[PDB]
Chain A
Amino acid sequence: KVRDQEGRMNYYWTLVEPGDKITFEATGNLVVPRYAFTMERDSGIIISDTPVH
C-alpha cells in the first residue's frame, strides 16, 4: 500500500503522425485520454532552485 492504494495504474504514451489514427478498444480497465498535445519537436531539462527573471 502506497498512498493508501492497493492497486496500480500504468501510464502509457504514444505519438500519432499526420494522417494516422489511434484506436481504443476496451471491455474495462481503461483510463481514456481527454486532452492530447499537438507538438512540433525541436533544449533540455535543468533541475535547479534558481529563480526565473
Chain B
Amino acid sequence: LFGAIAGFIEGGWTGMVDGWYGYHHQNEQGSGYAADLKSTQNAIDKITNKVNSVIEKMNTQFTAVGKEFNHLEKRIENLNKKVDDGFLDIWTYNAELLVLLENERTLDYHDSNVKNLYEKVRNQLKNNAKEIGNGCFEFYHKCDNTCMESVKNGTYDYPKYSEEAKLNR
C-alpha cells in the first residue's frame, strides 16, 4: 500500500470523466481537468493483459462429466463422486484465492501509479512550487497554459522560471 488513494490525496474527482489519473489546473486563463494520457494508457494496457492472462489460462478439452453405474458398483460410483467433488473444491478455492489476491495487486498498482505521478511532478518542479499537502502544488511564478502543458508532458523548463521564482520565494 503506497498511501495515495485515501492518503495525502483524500478523495477522487467526479469531474474527471476522461481518465483514471490526471491533473486539475487553476490559472488566470481558467480552471480545468485533464487526465494524464501516458499513465492511463499504460494502466489500461497492463490491466487488460491481466484480465486476458486470467481468462485465456483456463482452457480445457472436451470432457463428459456424468457417468452412470448400477447397484453393484456403489464403490466406483463413490469414487467418481469423490473425483468430481475434489476437483470442484480445488477449482473453487483457486478461483476465489486468485480473485482475492489480484484485487489487492490491482488496487496497490493504482496507488503506485498515483504516487509515481505525484513524485514525477514534484521532482520536475523542484523549488519553483510549494507543496500544499493535499497533492497540490502552488506556483511561485505566474505561468500559463504552455507551462501546464509542459509540466504535464514532462518537459518543464526549470531555469526559464528559476529567477522569477527566486524573487517570490
* A residues adjacent to B (C-beta < 8 A): 43-46
Which A residues lie within 8 Å of B11 (CB)? none
Write the chain B residue with the least CB distance to A44.
B64
Residues of chain B within 8 A (CB-CB) of A44 are 64-66
Total number of residue pairs linking A and B with CB closer than 8 Å: 8
CB distance from B149 to the nearest CB of A (A): 59
What are 8 of the A-B contact pairs (CB < 8 Å)?
A: A43-B62, A43-B64, A44-B64, A44-B65, A44-B66, A45-B66, A45-B68, A46-B66
Within 8 A of A (CB), among B59-116: 62, 64-66, 68
Tell me the complex Cα distance, A45–B67, Å.
9
Complex Cα spacing A45 to B64, Å: 9
Q: How far is the CA of A45 from the CA of B65 in the complex (A)?
A: 10
- Chain A residue contacts of B62, Cβ below 8 A: 43
Instruction: Fill in one digit per residue for B39-66: 1 if any A CB lies within 8 Å of its CB, else 0.
Output: 0000000000000000000000010111
* Chain A: minimal CB distance from B160 (Å): 72
A46 vs B67: C-alpha distance in the bound complex, in angstroms? 10
Tell me which residues across on chain B come within 8 A of A45, comparing CB atoms: 66, 68
User: Taking CB as reference atom, which chain B residue is nearest A43?
Assistant: B64
In the complex, how many angstroms separate the beta carbon of A10 from the nearest chain B beta carbon? Answer: 15
A residues near B65, Cβ cutoff 8 Å: 44
* B68: A residues at CB distance < 8 A: 45
